[PDB]
Symmetry: C3
Subunit: 123 residues, 3 copies
């Protein structure tokens, strides 16, 4: 079970489209306007305690990606307890409108290793 | 064992370079012209049933990345049964030519979690 | 335990901040000047033997992401025994400077699969 908190009543619970979907839909908590060739940190008003040995990759919705919208950053650490921001980059030709409640990205919980690092002289 | 279909004869089986290569090579099944500052959906004519508790990341080739070619979207869900498409972004200064058979990207089967979500008030 | 090798005394050992961090900080080994709209390969002068059944992802730092600095390529294969290079993309407005010892990205050891493929008729 992954515990999550809405910071304000503008936050929508992250949802999964289907039982075989890779990620959990993230929603914009506020209204944003993104000019062509600009980028914008979008607040979700969702904070969460991630599961152990993984991280949340904020990944792009495919439809938005064909409109020219990409993702910046997107690394949500296992110990990040703050507001989750989606960095949207408008690489399209037109101003991109974000309304409160718009599906803006997907959060994928990606399993990872935390290995020890040891310096040697030859591999 | 991942099962895949060649939708048309122009589809080419994804292959790994080496036993230590992260990704399977995706090939273009058609011929494309992509001008500077534009993107294009490339059809592979491949569809596949992904391994359970995982997804397919369409990741960039290092070669094309240095020439300013990037990858959009890239999330290939576990329950996806359609044609796998690749979003090539041309951020370089010259028209990038896509020939039938050209390696364009690499599918990576990334291990993930599907946790249940529960709403709480404090973390 | 993942072994690594410094190619020069200009390379800096990758670092961990906290138990819940995603990955390991990668540092520049040389001085670079990246003009707006350009990408530049950044040598870390670090070679390592990646652990089995995974790959290192050169992942963006959010601080830079917001300034307009994006990652290109970024797939470090299991059997890569060469110099790890970070492709930094200046999609910002000003020129981006990189001094030796600058925190440029993070490395994430993402768990992956190597399934055998099998062509079929139906799915
Ligand atoms: O680059 C891509 C991205 C997605 N796809 C396919 C695979 C994926 O399973 C499917 C996703 O379609 P949807 O747009 O219905 N879902 P998405 O996750 O993109 O966002 P949302 O569900 O919010 O629309 O499209 C590609 O072929 N290439
Ligand atoms: O798209 C993002 C990216 C990061 N974040 C969060 C997670 C991360 O823990 C935090 C960034 O904290 P830092 O002060 O460590 N930023 P820095 O640039 O130093 O490194 P990094 O961004 O890699 O943690 O912002 C988001 O909410 N959305
Ligand atoms: O950003 C990167 C990406 C890859 N690399 C390394 C790791 C990887 O093993 C290798 C990329 O493979 P190639 O140099 O053989 N290029 P090619 O296009 O042939 O294969 P790939 O699809 O892996 O790039 O370079 C970097 O140093 N920086
Ligand atoms: Cl990833
Ligand atoms: Mg979906």
């Amino acid at each position: 079970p992954v515990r999550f908190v809405k910071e304000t009543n503008r936050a929508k619970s992250p949802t999964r489209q289907s039982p075989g979907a890779a990620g959990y839909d993230l929603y914009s908590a506020y209204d944003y306007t993104i000019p062509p060739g600009e980028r914008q940190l979008i607040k979700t008003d969702i904070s969460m305690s991630m599961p152990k040995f993984c991280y949340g990759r904020i990944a792009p919705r495919s439809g938005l990606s064909l409109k020219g919208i990409d993702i910046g950053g997107g690394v949500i650490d296992e110990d990040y307890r703050g507001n989750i921001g989606v960095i949207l980059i408008n690489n399209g030709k037109c101003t991109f409108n974000v309304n409160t409640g718009d599906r803006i990205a997907q959060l994928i919980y990606q399993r990872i290793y935390y290995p020890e690092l040891e310096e040697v002289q030859s591999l």
